[PDB]
Amino acid sequence: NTLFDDIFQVSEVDPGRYNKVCRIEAASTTQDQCKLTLDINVELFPVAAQDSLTVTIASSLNATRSWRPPQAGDRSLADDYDYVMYGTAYKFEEVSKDLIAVYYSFGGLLMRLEGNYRNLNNLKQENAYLLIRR
Amino acid sequence: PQNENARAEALNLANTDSQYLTPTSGSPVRGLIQDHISAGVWLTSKDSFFTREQYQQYIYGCIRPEDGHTTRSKIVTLPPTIFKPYPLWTGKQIITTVLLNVTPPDMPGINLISKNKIKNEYWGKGSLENEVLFKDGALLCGILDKS
Amino acid sequence: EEPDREKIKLLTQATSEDGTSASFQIVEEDHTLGNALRYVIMKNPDVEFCGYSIPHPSENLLNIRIQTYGETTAVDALQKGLKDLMDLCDVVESKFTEKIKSM
Amino acid sequence: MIVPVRCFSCGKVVGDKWESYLNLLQEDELDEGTALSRLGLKRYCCRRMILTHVDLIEKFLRYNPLEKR
Amino acid sequence: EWNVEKFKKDFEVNISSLDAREANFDLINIDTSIANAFRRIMISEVPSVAAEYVYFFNNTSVIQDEVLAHRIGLVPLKVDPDMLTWVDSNLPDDEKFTDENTIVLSLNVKCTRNPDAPSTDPKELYNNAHVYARDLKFEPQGRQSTTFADCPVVPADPDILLAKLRPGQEISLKAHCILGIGGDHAKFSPVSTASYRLLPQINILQPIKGESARRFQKCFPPGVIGIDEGSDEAYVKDARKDTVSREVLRYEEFADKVKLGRVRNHFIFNVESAGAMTPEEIFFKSVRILKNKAEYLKNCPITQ
C-alpha cells in the first residue's frame, strides 16, 4: 500500500567526495512545507538540477516470504518506477508545531522528509520501499 | 599443560576471550590493527555497492557454517537496498549481515549511538557519516574505524 | 576398479536434512576452479546462495557452499555447475580452433 | 656472479643475452637503452636483469688454485 | 538469464598476432573468473620438462654445486610433454626413473690453456672456457632411442651461459629431467608471461575539436586518437593501443570532457613461451585442463 506520494522539484545535486552517490535537495510542488533530502545512486539513476521526480513511499509491492531475484512472469509495484530502494525509518522529529520530519536509512543512503499530516501513514517501520520515477 | 585441571583453567580463566578488557583501567586491549581499519573506511562507505554474486561471496568468505561460525546452520541474507535498475547491496549492509549470522538468534539486535574518528566535513555537504548508528543490529549510519 | 573417494567430501555438519543446503570440501584446489565454479552455479535460477572459501592458504582445501531455494538439492546444483563448465570450455576451444584455421 | 638464467619477475630466459649485450655496447657503440631493446627485453623487470648485472665471476676466476701463478 | 547456447552466440575470439614464441589474442564476452582461470593454469598447471636431479661427478669450478644444479633446472628444454609420463615419487630410486619418465642430460667439460700470441679475450686464450646450455648432451636411454630420434632433446635457448672455467677446472655431471607443473617450482612453468589486460574504454563526452584536439592527441599513444575536422573531430581510432597512463587527467582542460573506463568482458591475452611449446598450444592445453578439472569432480563420489 502507498504511504506517501508527491512530485518533488530537485534544486541541488551535490556529489561531495563520492563517485556514485549524490545528495539531492528537492522541494515539493503540491504543498509548501515538505522538503526532500536524499542520497541516490547517481550512476544508476542520473539526476540533474531542476528535475521533477515522483517520489512514492510504499509499504510493500503489488503473500511472499523474502527477496528472491525476479523471473519471467513477475508482477510488482516496481514495474512503474525507475529506481526502487528499500530501507528503515530510524527517527521521528517534530520540527515545530505542525511539522514532522521522518528519517530513512537505505543501507546508509539517508533520506529526510518534512511536512505535517503523515501521522496517518508513515510509521517507524523496518520496511519502506521508495520509488522515484522519471 | 598435562591434565584436565590445567586444561580447564587455560580454557576458562586464562583464555584470550576473558582478557578482552585489561584490569588496569577496564579498557579493551584487543582489536584489528592497520589494513582492517583502512578497509572498514572503504567497505562501510557510501560508494560501496555490491552485486549479488559479490555480496554472497563476501559473506561466505568470512563466515563458514562448517567451522561453527553461524548460530543458524544456514546463512541468512538481506534484501538489497536498490531493487529496480540493477539489484545491489551496500557495504554497510554486509556488516549488518555478519552480525546477523554470528549473534544468537533469540536475542534482539544491538542498539548503539557512537562516533567515528572521521569528521563530517571530509565527506562533503550535509553528510552524517560521523554518527555511528546501530539499530536492532543494522548499521544504518556512519563508517567504522579504529574507534 | 575403485574410484578416488578422497577428493570431494560433503561436510555433513553443515548439510541440511532436505539436502537443499550443503557444504563441500575439495582437496588440492584454490581460487582457480572455485571462482570459475561459483560463477557457473550462480547462473542457476534455483541457487539461493553460493560462495567458495579457502580456510587457510597453507593447506590446499576448497570449501564451496550451495543453498538452493528447494526443488533441487545442493548436490544436483553442484553437478549442473560442473556440467555447464565442461560445456563452457568446449565453446572456447571450438572458437579458438576455428580462428587459428581462419588466419 | 654469472648472469641469471631466467628473470626473477617475468621468467624470460635472460642468460643468453649477456654476451650479446656487451657486443652491442662495444662494437655497435649503442647506449644501454637501445641495446636492451634490440635484444628483445621490453618489460622493465626483464630490462633490469641485463642492465644492472655486475658479473663478478670474472673477478673470481683470477684466483685459480689449479694452475701455476 | 544465462545458458550455454547464450554464451556460444556472444563469445568471440580475435587473434591479433601469432608466432612461434608469443601470441596475442582477444576473448570477447567471457567472465573474469573464467579468464583468470585460463591465465592461472598456463602459469601454474600446464606441465613441462626440466632437470630435477643433478648428479655431480666432479665440479672444480668457481660456481658452487648447488648453484650450478639450480641453473641447469632453469634451462628450458625443447622436449614435448605428452612424450613423457609422470614419475612416481614414492617407490624408491632403483625403480623410479624409467626411460618413459626420464630424459638424461650429461655435461663433461674440461678447460685447458690455448697456446696463442697476444689482457686478451678468453675465447682466444683458453679452451672451453665458457660452458653453454648447448653443451648439454642428450643420452637416449632405453627404448626411446627411436622415438626421440625424430627430434632429439635440445635446450630451447642454446646460448644460456651456464658456467665459466679456467684451465685445470672441469665439470662432470648428469641430470635427470622429469615432468612437472609450475605450481611446484617455477622451472616447470611453460610460459614466460601468460597474462591479460582488459580493453580500455575512452569515453569522450563533450566535443573537443580544434587545437583542444591536437593536445588531446598527445595525452595518449599515437595511434589512439584521430582528427579529421570539426567534423569527425576527436575520436578513438584504436582503443586497444592505449596504455592506461591517465595522462589526460592531469590537465584541467579535459578533466570533465573525458572518462577512462574498461570494457569488462573483453580480455587481451598475451601468452609468451619458454620454448618447449608454441603459445597457441598451451592455451588449448589450458582450456582442456580446466575442463578435465571439472570432469574429475563430476565423475567422483560425494563422500560421507
Curated annotation (Swiss-Prot), chain A:
GO molecular function, one term: DNA binding
Chain spans, region Non-specific ssDNA binding: 14-37
Cellular component GO terms held in the UniProt record: nucleoplasm; nucleus; RNA polymerase I complex; RNA polymerase II, core complex; RNA polymerase III complex
Keywords of the record: Acetylation, DNA-binding, DNA-directed RNA polymerase, Nucleus, Phosphoprotein, Ribosome biogenesis, Transcription
GO biological process terms held by the UniProt record: nucleolar large rRNA transcription by RNA polymerase I; ribosome biogenesis; RNA-templated transcription; termination of RNA polymerase I transcription; termination of RNA polymerase III transcription; transcription by RNA polymerase I; transcription by RNA polymerase II; transcription by RNA polymerase III
Compartment(s): Nucleus
Keyword Transmembrane among UniProt keywords: no
InterPro entries: NA-bd_OB-fold, RPABC3
Chief place where the protein resides: nucleus
Subunit: Component of the RNA polymerase I (Pol I), RNA polymerase II (Pol II) and RNA polymerase III (Pol III) complexes. Component of the RNA polymerase I (Pol I) complex consisting of 14 subunits: RPA135, RPA190, RPC40, RPA14, RPB5, RPO26, RPA43, RPB8, RPA12, RPB10, RPC19, RPC10, RPA49 and RPA34. The complex is composed of a horseshoe-shaped core containing ten subunits (RPA135, RPA190, RPB5, RPO26, RPB8, RPB10, RPC10, RPA12, RPC19 and RPC40) where RPA135 and RPA190 form the DNA-binding cleft.
Note, other: Present with 6210 molecules/cell in log phase SD medium.
Listed PANTHER family: DNA-DIRECTED RNA POLYMERASES I, II, AND III SUBUNIT RPABC3
Family assignment from sequence similarity: Belongs to the eukaryotic RPB8 RNA polymerase subunit family.
Swiss-Prot record, chain B:
Source organism superkingdom: Eukaryota
Disulfide bond positions: none
Subcellular localization(s) per the UniProt record: Nucleus, Nucleolus
Homology family: Belongs to the RNA polymerase beta' chain family.
Subunit-level organization: Component of the RNA polymerase I (Pol I) complex consisting of 14 subunits: RPA135, RPA190, RPC40, RPA14, RPB5, RPO26, RPA43, RPB8, RPA12, RPB10, RPC19, RPC10, RPA49 and RPA34. The complex is composed of a horseshoe-shaped core containing ten subunits (RPA135, RPA190, RPB5, RPO26, RPB8, RPB10, RPC10, RPA12, RPC19 and RPC40) where RPA135 and RPA190 form the DNA-binding cleft. Outside of the core, RPA14 and RPA43 form the stalk that mediates interactions with transcription initiation factors and newly synthesized RNA.
Leftover remarks: Present with 2840 molecules/cell in log phase SD medium.
Its biological purpose: DNA-dependent RNA polymerases catalyze the transcription of DNA into RNA using the four ribonucleoside triphosphates as substrates. Component of RNA polymerase I (Pol I) which synthesizes ribosomal RNA precursors. Besides, RNA polymerase I has intrinsic RNA cleavage activity. RPA190 and RPA135 both contribute to the polymerase catalytic activity and together form the Pol I active center. In addition, subunit RPA12 contributes a catalytic zinc ribbon that is required for RNA cleavage by Pol I.
Protein name: DNA-directed RNA polymerase I subunit RPA190
From Swiss-Prot, chain C:
UniProt keyword Ubl conjugation, yes or no: yes
Record GO biological process: nucleolar large rRNA transcription by RNA polymerase I; ribosome biogenesis; termination of RNA polymerase I transcription; termination of RNA polymerase III transcription; transcription by RNA polymerase I; transcription by RNA polymerase III; transcription elongation by RNA polymerase I; transcription initiation at RNA polymerase I promoter
Main location: nucleus
GO molecular function annotations of the record: DNA binding; DNA-directed RNA polymerase activity; protein dimerization activity
Keywords in alphabetical order: DNA-directed RNA polymerase, Isopeptide bond, Nucleus, Phosphoprotein, Ribosome biogenesis, Transcription, Ubl conjugation
Cross-link (Glycyl lysine isopeptide (Lys-Gly) (interchain with G-Cter in ubiquitin)): 95
GO cellular component: nucleoplasm; nucleus; RNA polymerase I complex; RNA polymerase III complex
Compartments, record wording: Nucleus, Nucleolus
Note: Present with 8680 molecules/cell in log phase SD medium.
Record text on subunit structure and interactions: Component of the RNA polymerase I (Pol I) and RNA polymerase III (Pol III) complexes. Component of the RNA polymerase I (Pol I) complex consisting of 14 subunits: RPA135, RPA190, RPC40, RPA14, RPB5, RPO26, RPA43, RPB8, RPA12, RPB10, RPC19, RPC10, RPA49 and RPA34. The complex is composed of a horseshoe-shaped core containing ten subunits (RPA135, RPA190, RPB5, RPO26, RPB8, RPB10, RPC10, RPA12, RPC19 and RPC40) where RPA135 and RPA190 form the DNA-binding cleft.
Name of this protein: DNA-directed RNA polymerases I and III subunit RPAC2
Gene: RPC19
From Swiss-Prot, chain E:
Gene Ontology terms: biological process: nucleolar large rRNA transcription by RNA polymerase I; ribosome biogenesis; termination of RNA polymerase I transcription; termination of RNA polymerase III transcription; transcription by RNA polymerase I; transcription by RNA polymerase III; transcription elongation by RNA polymerase I; transcription initiation at RNA polymerase I promoter
Sample GO molecular function, one term: protein dimerization activity
CDD domains hit by this protein: RNAP_I_II_AC40
SMART domains to which the protein is assigned, alphabetical: RPOLD (SM00662)
The UniProt record lists the keyword Metal-binding: no
Localization terms from the record: Nucleus, Nucleolus
Domain of life from the UniProt record: Eukaryota
GO cellular component: nucleoplasm; nucleus; RNA polymerase I complex; RNA polymerase III complex
Gene3D superfamilies, per database record: DNA-directed RNA polymerase, insert domain (2.170.120.12), RNA polymerase, RBP11-like subunit (3.30.1360.10)
Pfam families given in the database record: RNA_pol_A_bac, RNA_pol_L
Alphabetical keyword list: Acetylation, DNA-directed RNA polymerase, Nucleus, Phosphoprotein, Ribosome biogenesis, Transcription
Role played: DNA-dependent RNA polymerases catalyze the transcription of DNA into RNA using the four ribonucleoside triphosphates as substrates. Common component of RNA polymerases I (Pol I) and III (Pol III) which synthesize ribosomal RNA precursors and small RNAs, such as 5S rRNA and tRNAs, respectively. RPC40 is part of the polymerase core and may function as a clamp element that moves to open and close the cleft.
PANTHER family in the record: DNA-DIRECTED RNA POLYMERASE, DNA-DIRECTED RNA POLYMERASES I AND III SUBUNIT RPAC1
